[PDB]
Design a binder for these strands. Structure first.
Lengths: 179, 178
DNA sequence: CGGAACATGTAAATAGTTACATGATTAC
DNA sequence: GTAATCATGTAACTATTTACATGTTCCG
């Protein structure tokens, strides 16, 4: 049984009303993009698939004067299909891929200097990313409970922030042992 | 623009200390390294062929028992440099690290059901943490340092541990809000 | 004996990225 | 002007998983 995560990502994204393929692409680049993403080149054929499967519907609006655009709504099938996925308990994956950690495992092939340089570089990026994430949190807070319509936003953002805090503190631990 | 070919570097790295079979490589992906990279044998064997055709690795045929053949792969000079350049290269950090649970979490708007789904995730992640702590204790029993031949193993284990601790702690925080 | 682990491949499919293509609207 | 962004789609390729397919060795 093929997983088809993207199908559920699209269906989930449409849960509060119509969106274009472009809007979908745009959401994968905002806060959700820390945990799932797809290129437009994957999304458009899939939108066609989901329509043929009868989970979604589209109408054709016009931006400006002659630019066509396709708004998508969930169907009865779509909402249910979505829901049957949402509450389904899934096994946690063994692997969550990280190319840096793969490098970490092969550390013996590096001299103290080379490893220090590698790990230092990673930290500076990870801290830069941490800044961007910390800033976003604040921009969200001025704008928190389960009732909140931004609770989904809050979840992905706090997770992403924690994830980078953890990565920074970990790297600093190894650098203390390296240097 | 140029294929990452991460699987090529996972293999060359796995051979950095000497010869291995495709079977051996498959196994390493099922042990502590599997927390951060895995491949199936069906991907590994064709890739081993490809790397041999590319001159990064070589192989001999050894015989287990009486008549079972085994190809043991070794790095070439060209492969060691290939490994080296990749290790010291500064790659940009990925925007997305995929997590299907966190996708689900984004769609919470669709109270009891959210509690159950998170409680289950808490329990499963508590379990994975217990297994990881156990493995960390097995490693430590056998004076850790950069010089230590098990530094890599230590790194992947600590990271995996930090990862679950932080996941478990997060899920608790969110559950108390709900 | 029998089952787990060892050992190696290929086929068919899904999943994902990069490159190829085009054109319209917004704001400076 | 012109650049960035909005907007949609197809082609080729790279990556990964599940299933198919075979046979040996170790150990109790």
């Amino acid at each position: 049984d093929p997983m088809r995560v993207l199908k559920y990502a699209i269906l989930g994204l449409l849960r509060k009303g119509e969106l274009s393929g472009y809007d979908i692409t745009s959401y994968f680049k905002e806060e959700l993009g820390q945990f799932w993403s797809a290129k437009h080149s994957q999304i458009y054929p899939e939108l066609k698939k989901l329509t043929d499967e009868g989970f979604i519907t589209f109408r054709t609006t016009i931006q400006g004067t002659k630019l066509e655009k396709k708004m998508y709504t969930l169907t009865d099938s779509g909402k249910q299909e979505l829901h049957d996925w949402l509450i389904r308990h899934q096994p946690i994956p063994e692997t969550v891929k990280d190319e840096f950690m793969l490098k970490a495992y092969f550390i013996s092939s590096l001299s103290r200097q080379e490893a220090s340089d590698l790990f230092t570089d990673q930290l500076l990026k990870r801290k830069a990313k941490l800044s961007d994430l910390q800033g976003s949190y604040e921009k969200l807070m001025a704008s928190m409970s389960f009732s909140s319509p931004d609770f989904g936003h809050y979840l992905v953002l706090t997770k992403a922030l924690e994830r980078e805090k953890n990565y920074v503190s970990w790297l600093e631990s190894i650098l203390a042992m390296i240097d």
